[PDB]
Amino acid sequence: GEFQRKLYKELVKNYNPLERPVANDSQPLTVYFSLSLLQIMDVDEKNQVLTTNIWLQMSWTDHYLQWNVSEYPGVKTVRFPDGQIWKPDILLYNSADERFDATFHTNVLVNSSGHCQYLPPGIFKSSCYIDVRWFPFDVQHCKLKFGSWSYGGWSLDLQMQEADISGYIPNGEWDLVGIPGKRSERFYECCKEPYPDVTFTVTMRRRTLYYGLNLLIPCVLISALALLVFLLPADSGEKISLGITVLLSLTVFMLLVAEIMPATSDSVPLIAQYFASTMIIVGLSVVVTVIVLQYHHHDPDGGKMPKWTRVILLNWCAWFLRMKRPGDPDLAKILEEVRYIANRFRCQDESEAVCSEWKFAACVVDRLCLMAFSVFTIICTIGILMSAPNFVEAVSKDFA
Amino acid sequence: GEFQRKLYKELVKNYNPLERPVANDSQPLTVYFSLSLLQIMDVDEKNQVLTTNIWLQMSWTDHYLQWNVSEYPGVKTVRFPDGQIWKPDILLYNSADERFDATFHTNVLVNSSGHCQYLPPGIFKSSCYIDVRWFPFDVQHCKLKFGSWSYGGWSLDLQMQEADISGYIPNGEWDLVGIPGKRSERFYECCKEPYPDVTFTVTMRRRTLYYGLNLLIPCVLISALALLVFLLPADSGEKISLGITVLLSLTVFMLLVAEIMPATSDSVPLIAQYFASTMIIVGLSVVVTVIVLQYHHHDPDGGKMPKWTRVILLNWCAWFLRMKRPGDPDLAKILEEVRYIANRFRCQDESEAVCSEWKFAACVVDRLCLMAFSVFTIICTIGILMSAPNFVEAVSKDFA
Amino acid sequence: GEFQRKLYKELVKNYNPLERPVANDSQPLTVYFSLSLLQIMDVDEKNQVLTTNIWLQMSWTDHYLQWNVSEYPGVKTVRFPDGQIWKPDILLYNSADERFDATFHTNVLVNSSGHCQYLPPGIFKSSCYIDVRWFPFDVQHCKLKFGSWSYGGWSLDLQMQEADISGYIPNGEWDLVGIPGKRSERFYECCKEPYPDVTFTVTMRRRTLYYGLNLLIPCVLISALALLVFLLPADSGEKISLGITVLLSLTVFMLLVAEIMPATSDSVPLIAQYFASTMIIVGLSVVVTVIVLQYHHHDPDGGKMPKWTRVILLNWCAWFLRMKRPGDPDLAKILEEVRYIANRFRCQDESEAVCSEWKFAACVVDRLCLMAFSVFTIICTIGILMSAPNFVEAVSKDFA
Amino acid sequence: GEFQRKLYKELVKNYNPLERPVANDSQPLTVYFSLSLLQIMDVDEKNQVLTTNIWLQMSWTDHYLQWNVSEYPGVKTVRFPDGQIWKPDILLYNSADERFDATFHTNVLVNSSGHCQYLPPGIFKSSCYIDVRWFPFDVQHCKLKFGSWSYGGWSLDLQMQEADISGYIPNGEWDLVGIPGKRSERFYECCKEPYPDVTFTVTMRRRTLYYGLNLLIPCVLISALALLVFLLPADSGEKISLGITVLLSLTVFMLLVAEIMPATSDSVPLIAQYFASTMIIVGLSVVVTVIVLQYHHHDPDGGKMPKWTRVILLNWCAWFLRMKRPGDPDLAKILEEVRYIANRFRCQDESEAVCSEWKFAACVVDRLCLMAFSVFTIICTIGILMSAPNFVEAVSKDFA
Amino acid sequence: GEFQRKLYKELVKNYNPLERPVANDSQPLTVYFSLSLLQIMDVDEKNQVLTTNIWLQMSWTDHYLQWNVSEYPGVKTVRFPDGQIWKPDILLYNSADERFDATFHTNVLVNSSGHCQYLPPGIFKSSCYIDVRWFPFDVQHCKLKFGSWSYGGWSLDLQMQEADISGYIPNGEWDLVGIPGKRSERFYECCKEPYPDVTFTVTMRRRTLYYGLNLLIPCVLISALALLVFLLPADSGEKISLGITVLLSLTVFMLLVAEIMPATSDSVPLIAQYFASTMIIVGLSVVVTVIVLQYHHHDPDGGKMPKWTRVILLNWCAWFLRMKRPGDPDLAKILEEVRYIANRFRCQDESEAVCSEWKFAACVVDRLCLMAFSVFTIICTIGILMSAPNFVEAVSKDFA
Ligand SMILES: *[C@@H]1O[C@H](CO)[C@@H](O[C@@H]2O[C@H](CO)[C@@H](O)[C@H](O)[C@H]2NC(C)=O)[C@H](O)[C@H]1NC(C)=O
Ligand SMILES: CN1CCC[C@H]1c1cccnc1
Known part of the structure; x- marks a missing residue:
């Protein structure tokens, strides 16, 4: 204009x-x-x-x-x-x-x-x-x-x-x-x-709904599944593989969270220490499985069960865990010949009776360590998760 | 110009x-x-x-x-x-x-x-x-x-x-x-x-053709293959390996899924619900496999069959799925020895009979859980996939 | 200037x-x-x-x-x-x-x-x-x-x-x-x-030289390796491990190649069809292995085979594949004992014969499935590769 | 203005x-x-x-x-x-x-x-x-x-x-x-x-707190876990699986580290030397496990223990590591038969004794190699870690 | 200014x-x-x-x-x-x-x-x-x-x-x-x-220091490790797992190497052909392991040893390899019933011999194929590595 x-x-x-x-x-x-x-x-x-x-x-x-x-x-x-x-x-x-x-x-x-x-x-x-x-x-x-x-x-x-x-x-x-x-x-x-x-x-x-669904719950479930090695019987021959495979899955989950974390060295992240605790628990479970497998495949005449081990496991632990214990000239030559076989069978029976005790001890240790490891896992997870502030606010807002 | x-x-x-x-x-x-x-x-x-x-x-x-x-x-x-x-x-x-x-x-x-x-x-x-x-x-x-x-x-x-x-x-x-x-x-x-x-x-x-053929069908096939752990005889030692390897495959599949989605906390994705359902099904299958393996390797003379388990498994369930149960001093001393041998063989026979009963119970449990898990997987997959709206129109346009 | x-x-x-x-x-x-x-x-x-x-x-x-x-x-x-x-x-x-x-x-x-x-x-x-x-x-x-x-x-x-x-x-x-x-x-x-x-x-x-040598030949070779599961004797319990390991490696392969391709839902690519067919082949091989293992570990005195199964397996297919099927009162008392022992041994021999016949049936099934799967793999690979136009030109201009 | x-x-x-x-x-x-x-x-x-x-x-x-x-x-x-x-x-x-x-x-x-x-x-x-x-x-x-x-x-x-x-x-x-x-x-x-x-x-x-908690400590833990292969009994079949899975878990760690680091070819990095040492230790452990397994499954009647091997292992080592060492016409015909049975039993017993001696030798080798490998691992880890000029500074500043 | x-x-x-x-x-x-x-x-x-x-x-x-x-x-x-x-x-x-x-x-x-x-x-x-x-x-x-x-x-x-x-x-x-x-x-x-x-x-x-330390050395080490299957006794039942693990490992090596290389089709790279040779060697080792396992688990009644296989394996390769080959009415009724057991034991002892022969043949095959593959891998690796020009120059300027 x-x-x-x-x-x-x-x-x-x-x-x-x-x-x-x-x-x-x-x-x-x-x-x-x-x-x-x-x-x-x-x-x-x-x-x-x-x-x-x-x-x-x-x-x-x-x-x-x-x-x-x-x-x-x-x-x-x-x-x-x-x-x-x-x-x-x-x-x-x-x-x-x-x-x-x-x-x-x-x-x-x-x-x-x-x-x-x-x-x-x-x-x-x-x-x-x-x-x-x-x-x-x-x-x-x-x-x-x-x-x-x-x-x-x-x-x-x-x-x-x-x-x-x-x-x-x-x-x-x-x-x-x-x-x-x-x-x-x-x-x-x-x-x-x-x-x-x-x-x-x-x-x-x-x-935190996405992270709770994608990183915490799956790892909780995997760690809980790792506890099943103490329920598998030793005769299956699959106890070690379960634990080592869970450890590999934990390593994969570790790299997953490591690729999103800053390289800062100011503090130890909650998720990092939680993963570390879970991995330590799995490793200790593997060690206990190795010890139990050593107990199971014991040589029947490779030694005698220690008195301390007996009084610790066979009776006290059974009481605590409520686990009952399991269980004409030819005539003389023929006589000696059958007596030899009878004595051989008696010796075999004695050896099997000896091995049964070691197997029962292995089972007792398995059950006791299952209980202890479950308690430890629950306590550690609950404490680590609850240590963070405003956790109640976060869960109440997101998950509800 | x-x-x-x-x-x-x-x-x-x-x-x-x-x-x-x-x-x-x-x-x-x-x-x-x-x-x-x-x-x-x-x-x-x-x-x-x-x-x-x-x-x-x-x-x-x-x-x-x-x-x-x-x-x-x-x-x-x-x-x-x-x-x-x-x-x-x-x-x-x-x-x-x-x-x-x-x-x-x-x-x-x-x-x-x-x-x-x-x-x-x-x-x-x-x-x-x-x-x-x-x-x-x-x-x-x-x-x-x-x-x-x-x-x-x-x-x-x-x-x-x-x-x-x-x-x-x-x-x-x-x-x-x-x-x-x-x-x-x-x-x-x-x-x-x-x-x-x-x-x-x-x-x-x-x-949805590409995402379907590359995401959902392989998941269906792997989850169905995970059910083969119930048809595998317990005399082999690969059931746990099967279950854990299927779990690893599902874990990597979930990682590939998670690396393409936003980290929002406003809703639970349909693919996330599907993957959680499949993971839970496989985990419970592994737990059932552990239970069956423990039942099969049950050591004899270490506990009798409970009456409740007897009536539930060997009487009712075996009826339901139409599966049947499987099936002169020298002469005196020689007589004593042969009597000992015969009695030992008789005890071995009764022990193996008890073992056979336990194995039959394990097989019955395996068949039951096979049927139950098949039904559960089918129902869960169908419901999760059909919950989404415009699913019918998407399938029609992308396939027919 | x-x-x-x-x-x-x-x-x-x-x-x-x-x-x-x-x-x-x-x-x-x-x-x-x-x-x-x-x-x-x-x-x-x-x-x-x-x-x-x-x-x-x-x-x-x-x-x-x-x-x-x-x-x-x-x-x-x-x-x-x-x-x-x-x-x-x-x-x-x-x-x-x-x-x-x-x-x-x-x-x-x-x-x-x-x-x-x-x-x-x-x-x-x-x-x-x-x-x-x-x-x-x-x-x-x-x-x-x-x-x-x-x-x-x-x-x-x-x-x-x-x-x-x-x-x-x-x-x-x-x-x-x-x-x-x-x-x-x-x-x-x-x-x-x-x-x-x-x-x-x-x-x-x-x-096509790089893509060939890096995508097609390894897949063919590994599929041929998966075909080797049918030559493993059933006693060595590694067939399931072999098959599932091959499946895991090939899922990894498919998910890796999926990253270099667009997400267009316009057609099914040749490589996608190839890997899907290989997936089905290996999965069916695993299923057949499970069936063969089920046949091998049969329970003696658990129901004899149907006559149809007998004539199909041990009569027709055995000949077709050119396979040979394998195979004073004290005197009275000791007589009864020895007779009992001998009768027990005879029953054991009969059970062993039944088990061996079952094992031979399992071997026959294994050989049949090996032949069928080899034929199917060759046919599917050749057809899928030769369906694509310009294949002859590409081969003759790159590899030759 | x-x-x-x-x-x-x-x-x-x-x-x-x-x-x-x-x-x-x-x-x-x-x-x-x-x-x-x-x-x-x-x-x-x-x-x-x-x-x-x-x-x-x-x-x-x-x-x-x-x-x-x-x-x-x-x-x-x-x-x-x-x-x-x-x-x-x-x-x-x-x-x-x-x-x-x-x-x-x-x-x-x-x-x-x-x-x-x-x-x-x-x-x-x-x-x-x-x-x-x-x-x-x-x-x-x-x-x-x-x-x-x-x-x-x-x-x-x-x-x-x-x-x-x-x-x-x-x-x-x-x-x-x-x-x-x-x-x-x-x-x-x-x-x-x-x-x-x-x-x-x-x-x-x-x-170095982040790297110390994320890279070195898990490697030490897995390397120590690899030492459990010498404590497992050879009766089970998980030694090779354990060793090879640990090798895979270390290979992926080396992969991630090589991804992080540049491709400069002027020096050998400290982490690279550490990974090479761990690789060599685990490989040698696997080789020793193979040797011990070969010793364990020795065929009786197919060879004899050399005098040098006997004096090296069964006496001097067994002292050093303090391991106990486990170990009318019809009458004539009947006599001949029972003599034959007992003679075959004697031969079986001798073969069993030879097998037990071989198993004890294998156990001695396992224990000795466990000790040697533990010493080697500790010495190598300390030597590699302590060579850093400012390792003391890092430990006293970040961790402390 | x-x-x-x-x-x-x-x-x-x-x-x-x-x-x-x-x-x-x-x-x-x-x-x-x-x-x-x-x-x-x-x-x-x-x-x-x-x-x-x-x-x-x-x-x-x-x-x-x-x-x-x-x-x-x-x-x-x-x-x-x-x-x-x-x-x-x-x-x-x-x-x-x-x-x-x-x-x-x-x-x-x-x-x-x-x-x-x-x-x-x-x-x-x-x-x-x-x-x-x-x-x-x-x-x-x-x-x-x-x-x-x-x-x-x-x-x-x-x-x-x-x-x-x-x-x-x-x-x-x-x-x-x-x-x-x-x-x-x-x-x-x-x-x-x-x-x-x-x-x-x-x-x-x-x-080439970085590449020769991160690609070449681990490849040759793992390839040498893959040769331990022939030294592994066949009663352990882990040869297939070892082979298949190593193969799968070497794929996560070839694929991640190909990740860093251009997709040209002008020539086949030296590292690519080396990886292909290594993978082929591992696959052939797996096939040979399958053959050895087939020979080991041969039932005694499933035929007779071919004459050519006899004269070759049991004699020629055995001597060449310097391997040692292992090695009133009641009286009548009792007589027959004991002779039956004696004949049963005689038949079992006779049938064990052919199984031992098959096991020895499997061992001979294992040793021979170990000898062959040991020279095969060395020849292939040395030829491929030394085929490249100025390899001596690169080695002398980088490593030495
Ligand atoms: C032009 O724009 C400015 C916007 O700030 C006007 O300033 C405001 O005018 C209103 C009306 O009187 C007052 O309530 C505000 O206090 C003024 N803000 C300030 C900082 O003084 C301004 O008046 C406008 N000028 C005309 C002619 O309309
Ligand atoms: C110091 N400068 C930077 C590099 C060269 C030098 C220079 C000299 C003359 C004109 N431009 C740059």
């Missing part, structure tokens, strides 16, 4: 985009900085970066970009692209993107009284400490630090407005507790100008 | 690219927006990102770019590159790309009466919610929200037009259902002026 | 890079387009993306860039960079790159009579449909569509020239068959003027 | 950004260069690339950018963007990014007496040698070489200032030791003028 | 960056081109690309950029940025980067007599044919072609200077043999002007 063209010609006359738009050069410029969270795109534990979709909000006043709306009836708002007017050089301090600035340079909305409005969008990548001590029952506090790179406090003082969460798109994995901000001042030793900056702390809680 | 040179010189006289080209500055400017779907490239379920290839279509009227073809006999249309003509700042809010705007800036073609056309191509990466509750039989809706950034409702009247799919290239994995649009007006915390936008919803259906 | 400087000053004056350089504005401008294929960089079957290194060849005539070499004795040609002279806006329609244009903008060489020559290079990524029906004996055709974006038929008369492959560098995996071109003009829903375009179809054949 | 506007207009009058701001041309321009390390983002061992977040600090004196504060009461400092004033072209020589420069060009702050400050941020990828000889117990030094490109020693006088680490953010995986700098000038084949440069050496130490 | 200010003002007056700075327009401009290699960043056999860090050296003479030093006493050099003076358009013909040009545009140094220097850095990703025929023992020649894109022989005379490697940083995997270069001319049919181009060939040698 005629009035629009005339005003656009008038405004850019003698305008210097390198100048701070203030009436008094000795006074700072009040700039209001805010934020508008849209969605949490990705949280990467290994690289320790956070990716979010954010609309920034910067607002200030311009002394030169003013006009009387009566002389320009139709026009009430003008718009300028990047590079034609002065804008704050607000940057994200802790950035992980290749190019240090990720915002998209849109237009600037200027009212009739000299009020500007800049809302650039972008996909921001920032580096924050992602603790994995209580994984998967985690709560993370990631920070976003914004501030003017070059303008100090005598020139541009930053003010904070509350972050806008309306329009947030919920994430499937993470639950947003909140996002509170804070305006802080820095005092350089040179001078006496406060340096205002705005920091936003995004606090989120992981939803 | 001389006419082209003269018209190009005239058209840029006192032309401001920052000015909105309207005759009356109080009236809005009508802009028509539409899409042109060319190809669906990627549907990343893990990252919830959709990649498409579309041509945006924008049309409006420029008041200043008008001329009479009588004075310029040859030229009818003109083309202006980026930076020399006014263009709407329409961009995608759902953008998941590093650079927020992913369009290729091309020329703007203009009428002899001021009608401008703008068809910029580009590959768009948006973020839409992907539902995995019914994978691989899911239907996905993904939204694309287009609208002007710094221009309010009182400046441009964004008018929606029906999307064009006349040049769509069919995808081998996703079947397009449609792409309708809706134009709505929203308020924002920034300002006090409504901001219109145009949203297009892309509806796709996943073809 | 002075003459070159003067000519450069003269040519630039009054020139407009926006106008179309034609003497008559009502006549179209003839532009010749051609390709120069240099290398095929990658064929991504997963993303259906083809990467090539080519040089575009564009040539036209400029009316305003003309001079007489007599007035400028030294200079014969001039070079203008991007943005200083008019250039056609020819770009690839079906681009798969984030930047829709991937051409390095070079200088434009100009005649002394107005002929312009443009040779921009670039690394082009194109989205072409890849058919995996006959993988790895398939032949692929990928299209490259070029044409002006904003210039219609009445303004820019595009023409086609045959592609140049004199500088082609052979690829290790893909063998080039040819690259023809076709020029056509279409109508678009935007406008009512035809828009011509030039399409180049790249036809190439996949070399 | 009016004063700011006038000063900005005055300062850029007759200014030339291509000119070096020195009052006297024959003298160099002193520039002070320093660093500001924020955090260490990534250390890629396979690609040998270090990624850091740093701020450069360059300060120099400009002769033309001076003004009197009394004439401009408000403004005390001015700021300029890129292109409008002269800046040093200081680059990182050993860059690894696709773009050779990764800094983000910010504004330049100027005194009222002409003192320019430049603090451009960026994320820098630099290629530095990575030593994996003592991995994980290793300390790495990575160089960062900065310096002007086209300015020599007679034009630019680079001066080094100590690096700042007050803003450092500790990294979990790596522990920073220090960052000293060094300034030196070199000669290049291009030119006959020295070119000074500043090199900062970042020295960091790897924290 | 005032002098350099006025010199910069004077030099750019009436300067056109579009023309060749030659005093005579008809005389070609001589340009000297060289290269300075610094690092071999990466070699990608799968993608057939080479990544290097390189400085380019271009030198020419500018006619218009001359001045008298006595007129400007303090100025001896001037520096110009991109787009301000004429520069050769030298490009890399066979680049593989997404952007065809991968150099960083630095300043151009001009001396007082018009001599220009240009040293742009960059990381170049070119494509070269990598031959994996003799992997790991490889020697690769990768080409780098540089030339002017749009300048002929009457315009540019591209001379050559030898490459500079004084600043080369040794790589940990590749040994730089050298970098020769050639200056080649191209003659066109149109014109008699040569078309100079400079190509540099990079000759590299792969250091």
